């Protein structure tokens, strides 16, 4: 009913997890906890080691002629379940399974990246590119032993964030540009309806223009850009538009011009874009566009992995442009965290 379960061969090394998605609050991440039932008669001297790892699998959609391991671990922890207070779920699992139930738990440190999967190109291959978290349990006399997967159970977990309860002030920004006569030229006021938007929710932007110059504007260009700030060995900012709208509206050489534009980012029209940041895949499935990474006020440290943010950019091709930053995120479930049984096309 409640807890997930997975097993691995004769070792009976069945690992139990109460949830697959662990929500992250900007200064406290939900503790990982679980139970790993095992058969001591089979383990004998071998110790039951469980490990949590966050791994960035970097470009191996490029470099296929070098197919090897293109990964770095961002975080690792290990716990010797078989030689911390037990949670209620852990207590219930121990009571149910009995003597051979040995619990485990990990504290994920704050400011690690959330589970984000970079989208494949055509001819997609391999587990993922991007950041994923994994729990595995295995039997060995030492953690340095070479595991051969015979008696190892591996589960992929996700670290996720949900939209904060209180939205901030509506994103408002403006830019002013002057040329030639420069008497009182264009100022480009732009304002979003709100700062926080949910996946599939339209993005509404209000824009104002005052074209008091001899040259007019031919088009009004509105688009939502995903700014995936990547970091591993070097740091980079990839701009991949997720919603784009072109308006042929023109501003006369006059004082005022008003209009409101609505956009809605979705994954159907952005599948072909290789490298687009997507919410971490729990398996070989499909997930929505990556949620904004919320950051604490301490420092936007070059933090490893992918940090995702969104801005809508409004441009006037007389060009005058201004960006409105916003948060694209799921609301807090108020229920069980996982996908809630999205139909499977068996």
């Amino acid at each position: 009913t409640r807890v997930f379960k997975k097993a691995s061969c004769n070792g009976k090394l069945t690992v139990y997890l109460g949830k697959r998605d662990f929500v992250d609050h900007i200064d406290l991440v939900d503790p990982v906890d679980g139970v790993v039932l095992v058969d001591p008669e089979y383990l004998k001297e071998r110790r039951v080691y469980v490990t949590l790892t966050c791994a960035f699998r970097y470009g191996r959609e490029d470099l296929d002629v070098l197919g090897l391991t293109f990964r770095k671990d961002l975080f690792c922890a290990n716990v010797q379940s078989f030689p911390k207070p037990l949670t209620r779920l852990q207590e219930r699992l121990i009571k149910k399974l009995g003597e051979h139930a040995y619990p485990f738990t990990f504290e994920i440190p704050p400011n690690l990246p959330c589970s984000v999967t970079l989208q494949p190109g055509p001819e997609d291959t391999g587990k993922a590119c991007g950041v994923d978290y994994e729990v595995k349990a295995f039997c060995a006399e030492n953690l340095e032993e070479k595991i051969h997967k015979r008696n190892s159970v591996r589960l992929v977990i996700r670290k996720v964030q949900y939209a904060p309860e209180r939205p901030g002030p509506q994103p408002t920004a403006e830019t002013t540009r002057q040329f030639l006569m420069s008497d009182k030229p264009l100022h480009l006021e732009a304002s979003l309806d709100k700062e926080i938007y949910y996946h599939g929710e339209p993005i509404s932007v209000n824009v104002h223009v005052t074209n008091n110059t001899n040259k007019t504007v031919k088009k009004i260009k509105i688009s939502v850009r995903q700014y995936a700030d990547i970091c591993l060995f070097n740091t980079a900012q990839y701009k991949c538009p997720v919603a784009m709208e072109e308006a042929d509206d023109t501003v006369a050489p006059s004082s005022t011009f008003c209009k409101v534009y609505t956009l809605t980012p979705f994954l159907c029209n952005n599948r072909e874009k290789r490298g687009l940041a997507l919410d971490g895949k729990l398996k070989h499935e499909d997930t929505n566009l990556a949620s904004s990474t919320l950051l604490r006020e301490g420092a936007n440290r070059e933090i490893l992995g992918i940090i995702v943010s969104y801005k809508v950019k409004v441009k006037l091709v007389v060009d005058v442009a201004v960006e409105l930053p916003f948060t694209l995120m799921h609301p807090k479930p108020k229920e069980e965290p996982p996908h809630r049984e999205v139909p499977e096309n068996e």
Partner: antibody, heavy 119, light 107 residues
Framework: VQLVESGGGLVQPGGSLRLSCAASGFNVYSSSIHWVRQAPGKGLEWVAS????????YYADSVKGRFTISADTSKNTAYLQMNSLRAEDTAVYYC?????????????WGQGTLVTVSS | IQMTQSPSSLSASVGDRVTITCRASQSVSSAVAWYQQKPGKAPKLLIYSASSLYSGVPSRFSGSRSGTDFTLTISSLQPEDFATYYCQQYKYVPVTFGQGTKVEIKR
């Protein structure tokens, strides 16, 4: 949130019919639209559904290849195309929606439109 | 997947406790929902996830799961509780509805 439906009528076997359900109070990309059968004196039966966010399209075995479901995001409405209507297609069709990501069952149902096929 | 509701037709009275039950051909996890449909009206969602009451539904309705078997309990009946209740599993694209169970006024 209201799902008003139109297109019900009387048709003969082998004909085609159009069902339109205007969507109000919810977004197509943030919701998944479904169509459900109910034959006279029988239970419910799913026939087709669409998820605009992932632009999926699913149909029942008795409906696969015969009907087609499309959604108009600009007009905020969903259309079901019916072809090669047969005698057993006679049923009341309801348009229902569900949250696009966290399904959580079919929350809102529109007033069904009666579709009858006979010679 | 096939979902068979054991009671094809049920009879009860106001204030009585009614427990509708259903069973699936194979495990469908907690992805089971229950609907209420008055004659001549569209179905109304009662419970989703086989244990979560839909917002605005009376608190008397309650859902339960036992393996492949799912149970709906109406608790203290009311005059508005006499209708047809349908189950549904949505773990797989081929969503299957139950045969339906009618609640009859008993005298």
């Amino acid at each position: 949130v209201q799902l008003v439906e139109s297109g019900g009528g009387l048709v003969q076997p082998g004909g085609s019919l159009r069902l339109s359900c205007a969507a109000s109070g919810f977004n197509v990309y943030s919701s998944s639209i479904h169509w459900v059968r109910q034959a006279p004196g029988k239970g419910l039966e799913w026939v087709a559904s669409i998820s605009s966010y992932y632009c999926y399209t699913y149909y029942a075995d008795s409906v696969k290849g015969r009907f087609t479901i499309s959604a108009d995001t600009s007009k905020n409405t969903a259309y079901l195309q019916m072809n090669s209507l047969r005698a057993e297609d006679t049923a009341v069709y309801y348009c229902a929606r569900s949250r696009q990501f966290w399904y959580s069952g079919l929350d809102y149902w529109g007033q069904g439109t009666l579709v009858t096929v006979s010679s | 997947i096939q979902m068979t509701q054991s009671p094809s037709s049920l009879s009860a009275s106001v204030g009585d406790r009614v427990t509708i039950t259903c069973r699936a051909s194979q495990s469908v996890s907690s992805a089971v929902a229950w609907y209420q449909q008055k004659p001549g009206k569209a179905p109304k969602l009662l419970i989703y996830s086989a244990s979560s009451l839909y917002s605005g539904v009376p608190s008397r309705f309650s859902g339960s799961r036992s393996g492949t078997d799912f149970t709906l309990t109406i608790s203290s009946l009311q005059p508005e509780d006499f209708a047809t209740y349908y189950c549904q599993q949505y773990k797989y694209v081929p969503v299957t509805f139950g045969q339906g169970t009618k609640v009859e006024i008993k005298r």
